[PDB]
Design a binder for this molecule. Structure first.
Ligand SMILES: NS(=O)(=O)c1ccccc1OC(F)F
Length: 185
């Protein structure tokens, strides 16, 4: 792909984080802590899952960023509406305001309803995410495999400002402690 020139500097919004997450000083990395991180509760925090939003809001234009997923067993990545549900149980779907892909149990899937199997020959260590607001497109790229396309959501109905979306996943296995990291431009 040739989307690299739309690169944006994403930072994580601490106030939206699940209370077990640990965000680095530079707001560019996040991982699952082994306990509650001693923060007050608020209406923005994702309560049920290890999720956090980017601080940036997008309502027009083309945007691109990259995320490092090295040695993780489970994660979700993409964008979502600013007004997505924060509390309780929900599925990641465009109907609920999410445009995402994930790794889970050794398979990659797009967060359609129902979910779509992805075909990845080279397990990615870094993912590129491209949003074209006007066109209604969210695309995912395999940076480890020379930028090959993973998935395109088209005919998106954003219906609001978009925020970068992250889920570090649970660590029931002891094999999923590694962070998500926003990669430098
Ligand atoms: N398993 S846990 O108690 O450490 C936990 C941590 C963050 C969010 C949800 C959660 O548990 C359950 F709601 F899924």
């Amino acid at each position: 792909h040739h989307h690299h020139h739309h690169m944006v500097h994403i930072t994580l919004d601490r106030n939206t984080a699940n209370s077990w997450l640990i965000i680095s000083k530079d707001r560019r990395q996040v991982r699952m802590g082994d306990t509650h991180q001693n923060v007050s509760d608020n209406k923005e925090r994702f309560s049920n899952y290890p999720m956090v939003l980017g601080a940036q809001r997008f309502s027009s234009g083309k945007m691109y960023w990259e995320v490092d997923v090295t040695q993780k067993e489970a994660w979700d990545l993409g964008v979502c509406r600013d007004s997505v549900q924060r509390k309780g149980q929900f599925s990641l779907s465009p109907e609920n305001g999410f445009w995402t892909i994930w790794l889970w149990q050794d398979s990659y899937e797009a967060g359609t309803s129902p979910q779509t199997t992805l075909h990845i020959q080279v397990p990615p260590c870094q993912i590129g995410i491209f949003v074209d607001y006007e066109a209604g497109v969210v695309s995912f790229y395999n940076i480890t495999d020379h930028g090959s396309l993973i998935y395109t959501f088209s005919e998106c109905v954003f219906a609001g400002p978009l925020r970068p979306f992250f889920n570090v996943g649970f660590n029931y296995s002891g094999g999923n402690a590694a962070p998500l990291k926003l990669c430098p431009l």
